[PDB]
Tab-separated table of C-alpha atoms and ligand atoms in Angstrom:
chain	number	residue	atom	x	y	z
A	17	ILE	CA	0.065	-0.127	-0.244
A	18	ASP	CA	0.816	3.855	-1.103
A	19	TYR	CA	-0.435	5.596	1.807
A	20	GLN	CA	-0.246	8.862	-0.864
A	21	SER	CA	-0.564	7.647	-4.083
A	22	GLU	CA	-3.575	9.265	-5.513
A	23	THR	CA	-5.016	6.070	-5.704
A	24	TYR	CA	-4.965	5.978	-2.176
A	25	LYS	CA	-5.902	9.444	-1.210
A	26	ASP	CA	-8.581	9.258	-2.940
A	27	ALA	CA	-9.363	6.409	-0.908
A	28	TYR	CA	-9.493	7.707	2.063
A	29	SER	CA	-11.435	10.806	1.651
A	30	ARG	CA	-14.276	8.839	0.696
A	31	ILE	CA	-13.782	6.308	3.625
A	32	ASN	CA	-12.517	8.681	5.921
A	33	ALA	CA	-15.599	10.854	5.904
A	34	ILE	CA	-17.485	8.093	6.491
A	35	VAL	CA	-16.386	7.151	9.273
A	36	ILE	CA	-16.720	10.593	9.601
A	37	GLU	CA	-20.287	11.119	9.239
A	38	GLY	CA	-21.283	8.543	10.847
A	39	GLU	CA	-19.473	8.969	14.462
A	40	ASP	CA	-21.233	12.604	13.552
A	41	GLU	CA	-25.022	11.305	13.260
A	42	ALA	CA	-24.216	7.702	15.702
A	43	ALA	CA	-23.626	11.245	17.926
A	44	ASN	CA	-26.323	13.274	17.288
A	45	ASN	CA	-29.349	10.128	17.074
A	46	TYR	CA	-27.865	9.006	20.694
A	47	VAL	CA	-29.076	12.072	21.845
A	48	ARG	CA	-32.166	12.032	20.385
A	49	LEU	CA	-33.323	8.836	21.607
A	50	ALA	CA	-32.059	10.683	25.526
A	51	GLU	CA	-34.583	12.393	24.605
A	52	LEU	CA	-37.239	9.595	23.529
A	53	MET	CA	-35.729	7.270	26.202
A	54	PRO	CA	-35.566	9.568	29.251
A	55	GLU	CA	-35.270	6.508	31.721
A	56	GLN	CA	-32.034	5.830	30.149
A	57	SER	CA	-30.622	9.545	28.835
A	58	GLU	CA	-27.839	9.657	31.517
A	59	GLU	CA	-26.050	6.345	29.270
A	60	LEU	CA	-26.941	7.624	26.268
A	61	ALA	CA	-25.934	11.434	26.282
A	62	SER	CA	-22.271	8.824	27.862
A	63	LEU	CA	-22.061	7.366	23.968
A	64	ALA	CA	-22.931	10.273	22.371
A	65	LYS	CA	-20.265	12.319	23.737
A	66	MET	CA	-17.923	9.560	23.440
A	67	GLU	CA	-19.070	8.988	19.316
A	68	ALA	CA	-17.909	12.476	18.963
A	69	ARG	CA	-15.247	11.768	20.333
A	70	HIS	CA	-14.181	9.414	17.681
A	71	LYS	CA	-14.842	11.917	15.251
A	72	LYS	CA	-12.308	14.014	16.275
A	73	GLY	CA	-9.622	10.715	15.497
A	74	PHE	CA	-11.368	9.948	12.832
A	75	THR	CA	-10.949	13.596	11.406
A	76	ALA	CA	-6.842	13.574	12.988
A	77	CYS	CA	-6.745	10.306	10.249
A	78	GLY	CA	-7.137	11.989	7.556
A	79	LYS	CA	-5.285	15.858	7.997
A	80	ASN	CA	-1.844	13.391	8.640
A	81	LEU	CA	-2.641	11.622	5.612
A	82	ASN	CA	-3.326	15.555	3.451
A	83	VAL	CA	-6.705	14.010	2.905
A	84	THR	CA	-9.803	16.666	3.091
A	85	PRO	CA	-12.560	14.168	3.821
A	86	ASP	CA	-15.343	14.181	1.663
A	87	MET	CA	-18.573	14.794	3.312
A	88	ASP	CA	-20.987	15.228	0.712
A	89	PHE	CA	-20.409	12.013	-0.238
A	90	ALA	CA	-20.854	10.697	3.016
A	91	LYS	CA	-23.577	12.705	4.256
A	92	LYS	CA	-24.896	11.274	0.323
A	93	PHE	CA	-23.830	7.706	1.475
A	94	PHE	CA	-26.035	7.855	4.726
A	95	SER	CA	-29.148	9.253	3.571
A	96	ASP	CA	-31.340	6.092	3.201
A	97	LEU	CA	-31.348	4.992	6.697
A	98	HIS	CA	-30.400	8.079	8.467
A	99	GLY	CA	-33.759	8.892	6.763
A	100	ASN	CA	-35.015	5.724	8.236
A	101	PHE	CA	-34.615	6.357	11.785
A	102	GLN	CA	-35.967	10.086	11.307
A	103	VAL	CA	-38.657	9.008	9.988
A	104	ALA	CA	-38.564	6.772	12.624
A	105	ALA	CA	-37.401	8.887	15.562
A	106	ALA	CA	-39.688	11.556	14.621
A	107	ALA	CA	-42.744	8.802	15.082
A	108	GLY	CA	-41.624	7.413	18.869
A	109	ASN	CA	-40.136	4.156	16.941
A	110	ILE	CA	-37.257	3.162	19.428
A	111	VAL	CA	-37.147	-0.285	18.723
A	112	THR	CA	-36.047	0.708	15.152
A	113	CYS	CA	-34.370	3.147	15.882
A	114	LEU	CA	-32.280	1.314	18.068
A	115	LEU	CA	-31.664	-1.830	15.430
A	116	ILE	CA	-30.057	0.780	13.204
A	117	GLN	CA	-27.974	2.262	15.638
A	118	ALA	CA	-27.318	0.004	17.940
A	119	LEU	CA	-26.833	-2.979	15.785
A	120	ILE	CA	-26.253	-2.494	12.581
A	121	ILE	CA	-25.060	0.275	11.962
A	122	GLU	CA	-22.482	-0.133	15.090
A	123	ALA	CA	-21.249	-4.855	13.909
A	124	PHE	CA	-21.081	-2.488	10.144
A	125	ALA	CA	-18.752	0.106	12.127
A	126	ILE	CA	-16.619	-2.690	14.991
A	127	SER	CA	-16.146	-5.361	11.552
A	128	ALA	CA	-14.971	-2.795	9.254
A	129	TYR	CA	-12.583	-0.643	12.106
A	130	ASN	CA	-10.694	-4.124	12.676
A	131	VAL	CA	-10.965	-4.715	8.196
A	132	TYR	CA	-9.193	-1.842	8.034
A	133	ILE	CA	-6.526	-1.549	10.867
A	134	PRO	CA	-3.789	-4.441	9.929
A	135	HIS	CA	-3.791	-2.504	7.437
A	136	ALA	CA	-3.301	1.046	8.216
A	137	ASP	CA	-0.443	3.293	8.489
A	138	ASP	CA	1.294	4.092	12.723
A	139	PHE	CA	-0.761	6.707	13.680
A	140	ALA	CA	-4.601	5.445	12.373
A	141	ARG	CA	-3.542	1.855	13.355
A	142	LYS	CA	-2.776	3.675	16.906
A	143	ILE	CA	-6.638	6.151	16.666
A	144	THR	CA	-8.119	2.841	15.123
A	145	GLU	CA	-7.768	0.282	17.754
A	146	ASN	CA	-8.222	2.998	20.896
A	147	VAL	CA	-11.267	3.544	18.976
A	148	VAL	CA	-12.266	0.233	18.727
A	149	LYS	CA	-11.201	-0.856	22.599
A	150	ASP	CA	-13.975	2.183	23.362
A	151	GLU	CA	-16.606	1.241	20.864
A	152	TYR	CA	-16.902	-2.085	22.825
A	153	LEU	CA	-15.219	-1.013	26.323
A	154	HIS	CA	-18.367	0.072	27.399
A	155	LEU	CA	-21.310	-2.079	27.094
A	156	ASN	CA	-24.018	-2.290	24.510
A	157	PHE	CA	-26.950	-0.480	25.286
A	158	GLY	CA	-29.557	-0.258	22.386
A	159	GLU	CA	-29.113	-4.210	22.446
A	160	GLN	CA	-29.751	-5.181	27.135
A	161	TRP	CA	-32.776	-2.942	26.044
A	162	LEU	CA	-33.672	-4.983	23.495
A	163	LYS	CA	-32.921	-8.037	24.673
A	164	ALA	CA	-35.187	-6.562	28.394
A	165	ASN	CA	-38.020	-5.718	26.115
A	166	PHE	CA	-38.440	-8.307	23.639
A	167	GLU	CA	-41.162	-10.229	23.612
A	168	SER	CA	-42.441	-7.140	23.399
A	169	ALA	CA	-39.977	-5.156	20.710
A	170	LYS	CA	-39.886	-8.921	17.681
A	171	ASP	CA	-42.762	-7.866	15.265
A	172	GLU	CA	-40.718	-4.449	15.076
A	173	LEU	CA	-37.572	-5.980	14.856
A	174	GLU	CA	-38.161	-7.926	12.157
A	175	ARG	CA	-39.899	-5.017	10.626
A	176	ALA	CA	-36.821	-2.720	11.245
A	177	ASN	CA	-34.793	-5.415	9.852
A	178	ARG	CA	-35.602	-6.515	6.353
A	179	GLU	CA	-36.353	-2.721	5.305
A	180	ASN	CA	-32.452	-1.572	6.820
A	181	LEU	CA	-30.184	-4.539	6.362
A	182	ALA	CA	-30.680	-4.436	2.787
A	183	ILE	CA	-29.865	-0.394	2.482
A	184	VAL	CA	-26.724	-1.643	4.612
A	185	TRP	CA	-26.024	-4.381	1.912
A	186	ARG	CA	-26.489	-1.897	-0.582
A	187	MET	CA	-24.130	0.959	1.552
A	188	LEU	CA	-20.602	-1.689	1.854
A	189	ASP	CA	-21.713	-2.492	-1.727
A	190	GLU	CA	-20.708	0.972	-2.976
A	191	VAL	CA	-17.607	1.136	-1.000
A	192	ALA	CA	-15.754	-2.722	-1.410
A	193	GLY	CA	-13.648	-0.672	-3.996
A	194	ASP	CA	-12.439	1.663	-1.796
A	195	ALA	CA	-11.938	-0.544	1.267
A	196	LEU	CA	-10.553	-2.782	-1.284
A	197	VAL	CA	-8.484	0.435	-1.939
A	198	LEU	CA	-7.104	0.761	1.262
A	199	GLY	CA	-6.376	-3.100	1.678
A	200	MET	CA	-9.987	-4.306	2.965
A	201	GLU	CA	-11.044	-7.916	0.846
A	202	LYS	CA	-15.459	-6.853	0.796
A	203	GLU	CA	-15.495	-10.678	1.716
A	204	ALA	CA	-13.740	-9.828	5.943
A	205	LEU	CA	-16.172	-7.201	5.537
A	206	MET	CA	-19.455	-9.073	5.259
A	207	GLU	CA	-18.436	-12.460	7.371
A	208	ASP	CA	-17.749	-9.816	10.105
A	209	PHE	CA	-20.849	-7.555	10.162
A	210	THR	CA	-22.661	-11.235	9.471
A	211	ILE	CA	-21.280	-12.432	12.563
A	212	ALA	CA	-21.580	-9.330	15.014
A	213	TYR	CA	-25.578	-8.684	13.260
A	214	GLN	CA	-26.303	-12.299	13.790
A	215	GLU	CA	-25.280	-12.935	17.012
A	216	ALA	CA	-26.409	-9.480	18.259
A	217	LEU	CA	-29.820	-10.617	17.226
A	218	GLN	CA	-29.354	-14.408	18.166
A	219	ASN	CA	-28.883	-12.506	22.254
A	220	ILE	CA	-31.555	-10.499	22.517
A	221	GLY	CA	-33.789	-12.795	21.658
A	222	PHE	CA	-34.276	-14.865	17.720
A	223	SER	CA	-33.060	-17.805	17.164
A	224	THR	CA	-30.620	-19.164	15.209
A	225	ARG	CA	-33.057	-20.837	13.096
A	226	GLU	CA	-34.843	-17.065	12.571
A	227	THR	CA	-31.168	-14.809	12.701
A	228	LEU	CA	-30.925	-16.605	9.100
A	229	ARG	CA	-34.052	-15.732	8.131
A	230	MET	CA	-33.764	-12.558	9.072
A	231	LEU	CA	-30.120	-11.935	6.974
A	232	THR	CA	-31.740	-13.147	4.400
A	233	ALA	CA	-34.316	-10.795	4.562
A	234	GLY	CA	-31.313	-8.246	3.679
A	235	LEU	CA	-30.265	-9.677	0.736
A	236	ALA	CA	-32.895	-8.550	-1.538
A	237	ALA	CA	-33.499	-5.856	-0.993
B	5	OCD	C1	-9.635	6.027	9.475
B	5	OCD	C2	-9.840	5.430	8.678
B	5	OCD	C3	-10.774	4.519	9.216
B	5	OCD	C4	-11.713	3.651	7.668
B	5	OCD	C5	-12.419	1.821	8.307
B	5	OCD	C6	-13.369	1.223	7.292
B	5	OCD	C7	-14.236	2.329	6.956
B	5	OCD	C8	-15.226	1.530	6.165
B	5	OCD	C9	-17.222	2.162	5.302
B	5	OCD	C10	-17.850	1.294	5.807
B	5	OCD	C11	-17.742	1.883	8.219
B	5	OCD	C12	-19.642	2.792	8.364
B	5	OCD	C13	-18.689	3.503	9.102
B	5	OCD	C14	-19.931	3.790	10.330
B	5	OCD	C15	-19.101	4.741	11.452
B	5	OCD	C16	-20.357	5.003	12.691
B	5	OCD	C17	-21.444	4.268	13.423
B	5	OCD	C18	-20.485	4.185	15.140
B	5	OCD	O1	-20.857	3.782	16.091
């Protein structure tokens, strides 16, 4: 990997932006959730501070490589998912909101960061390994809530899944090519995501059988 060829910097500027916008949208989303579940607003506000901290770390990984992040691509990358969260939030569909942010985006984020790490430069390797440390040193707030609320949330979780997984698989298809310039094999991303997300869904209470039915519902569309 030439960390400064135009190929690379070009790929990095979208990927860095995706990560930066990703953390920004998490921060706002967890703040917004703090409103919808004021019972748990203390944890959620702490989660949001944390995401906002990672925003700064990932901002520095661009600058170190002399890359301006392409924020408009990243904002347009997130757009449908952001939409479904907004709509689901605007109507108090907290179950849907939590699937999106606490399970889906999170599996995807963690898997990506983990697949990036072996192939990242020294500075960004450090920053990402810390983000990962933190982003699973604190516990998956949204997952424990969905597990404790499972019987009630079960049917909405299935609807949320079909609508939202579908999109996240569209999202990986669009940056596969860019991720590969960063040394990230599309397959490794798919596996890690699928494992994390499958095991999050089983943990909150679906059978294996049910999880598979759910993951397949994502493929198409
Ligand atoms: C410094 C650049 C780090 C590169 C990581 C590779 C990212 C691959 C593309 C998909 C990433 C989706 C990130 C979403 C992060 C926001 C959610 C955080 O909890």
